[PDB]
Design an enzyme around this catalytic site. Structure first.
Site, mmCIF file in Angstrom:
data_model
loop_
_atom_site.group_PDB
_atom_site.id
_atom_site.type_symbol
_atom_site.label_atom_id
_atom_site.label_comp_id
_atom_site.label_asym_id
_atom_site.label_seq_id
_atom_site.Cartn_x
_atom_site.Cartn_y
_atom_site.Cartn_z
ATOM 1 N N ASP A 12 -26.131 -29.745 -24.192
ATOM 2 C CA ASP A 12 -26.826 -28.997 -23.690
ATOM 3 C C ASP A 12 -25.843 -28.176 -22.545
ATOM 4 O O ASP A 12 -25.751 -28.653 -21.625
ATOM 5 C CB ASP A 12 -28.159 -28.986 -23.198
ATOM 6 C CG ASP A 12 -29.058 -27.986 -22.878
ATOM 7 O OD1 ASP A 12 -28.391 -26.875 -22.937
ATOM 8 O OD2 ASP A 12 -30.066 -28.156 -22.666
ATOM 9 N N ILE A 16 -30.130 -29.468 -17.411
ATOM 10 C CA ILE A 16 -31.423 -29.644 -17.109
ATOM 11 C C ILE A 16 -32.042 -28.271 -17.371
ATOM 12 O O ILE A 16 -31.664 -27.376 -16.532
ATOM 13 C CB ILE A 16 -31.635 -30.424 -16.044
ATOM 14 C CG1 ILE A 16 -31.189 -31.789 -15.913
ATOM 15 C CG2 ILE A 16 -33.111 -30.306 -15.554
ATOM 16 C CD1 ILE A 16 -31.159 -32.361 -14.381
ATOM 17 N N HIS A 17 -33.002 -28.122 -18.313
ATOM 18 C CA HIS A 17 -33.742 -26.728 -18.051
ATOM 19 C C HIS A 17 -35.367 -26.970 -18.714
ATOM 20 O O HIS A 17 -35.471 -27.861 -19.662
ATOM 21 C CB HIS A 17 -32.823 -26.049 -19.185
ATOM 22 C CG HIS A 17 -33.075 -26.609 -20.512
ATOM 23 N ND1 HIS A 17 -33.520 -26.101 -21.502
ATOM 24 C CD2 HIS A 17 -32.413 -27.741 -20.918
ATOM 25 C CE1 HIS A 17 -33.142 -26.861 -22.891
ATOM 26 N NE2 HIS A 17 -32.393 -27.821 -22.574
ATOM 27 N N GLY A 18 -36.366 -26.309 -18.109
ATOM 28 C CA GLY A 18 -37.600 -26.543 -18.660
ATOM 29 C C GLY A 18 -37.972 -28.042 -18.582
ATOM 30 O O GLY A 18 -37.472 -28.643 -17.743
ATOM 31 N N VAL A 20 -37.670 -30.062 -20.735
ATOM 32 C CA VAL A 20 -36.758 -30.779 -22.039
ATOM 33 C C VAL A 20 -36.289 -32.157 -21.338
ATOM 34 O O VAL A 20 -36.497 -33.169 -21.890
ATOM 35 C CB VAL A 20 -35.680 -29.718 -22.297
ATOM 36 C CG1 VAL A 20 -34.758 -30.295 -23.137
ATOM 37 C CG2 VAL A 20 -36.161 -28.383 -22.972
#
Length: 165
Positions: A12, A16-18, A20
């Site tokens: 990714d 780190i995102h949202g 998720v």
């Protein structure tokens, strides 16, 4: 093999995102997350923000490809379950060439860009990304494409087979 245990390998460009990373950490039962990227490791400001926003009870680390191979070569993490975060499948093949053992790779997301072909709603691949996926498959490594564990799993080769052929 009797060393660190790769609980999961997620690719990714956003790291780190949202939720998720939050949801995947609890489902993957991961208490440790290691980021492998020389460009990010060279950004002290981003490292501070990622380390200060590390989910509770979860530790986030930032290392380069050369250093990640050495961390895995240390039985100090034997049995320990660690999740590997990558920005491009090229860095995954490099760890494998160093003797790192990977049974399957999961494509979380890849920022689209001009010159690339869209294989999924948020997954883009260039002739270089495709070449890395084909080599992992030739090694018997499984390649699955999915944004969330609740979404149906698609095969990376199948998506590239309906584009590349």
């Amino acid at each position: 093999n009797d060393y660190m245990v790769i609980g999961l390998a997620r690719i990714d460009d956003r790291l780190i995102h949202g939720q998720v990373a939050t949801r995947w950490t609890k489902e993957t039962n991961v208490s440790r997350i290691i980021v492998v990227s020389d460009e990010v490791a060279a950004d002290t400001v981003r490292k501070t923000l990622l380390t200060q926003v590390a989910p509770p009870g979860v530790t986030a680390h930032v290392v380069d490809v050369a250093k990640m191979i050495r961390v895995y070569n240390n039985p100090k993490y034997a049995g320990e379950r660690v999740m590997l975060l990558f920005t491009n499948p090229t860095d995954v093949e490099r760890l494998v060439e160093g003797g790192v053992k990977i049974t399957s790779v999961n494509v979380g997301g890849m920022a689209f860009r001009q010159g690339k072909t869209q294989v999924n709603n948020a997954v883009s691949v260039d002739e270089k990304d495709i070449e890395a996926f084909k080599k992992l498959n030739a090694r018997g490594i499984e390649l699955e494409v999915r944004k969330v564990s609740t979404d149906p799993k698609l095969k990376m080769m199948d998506l590239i087979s309906k584009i590349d052929k």
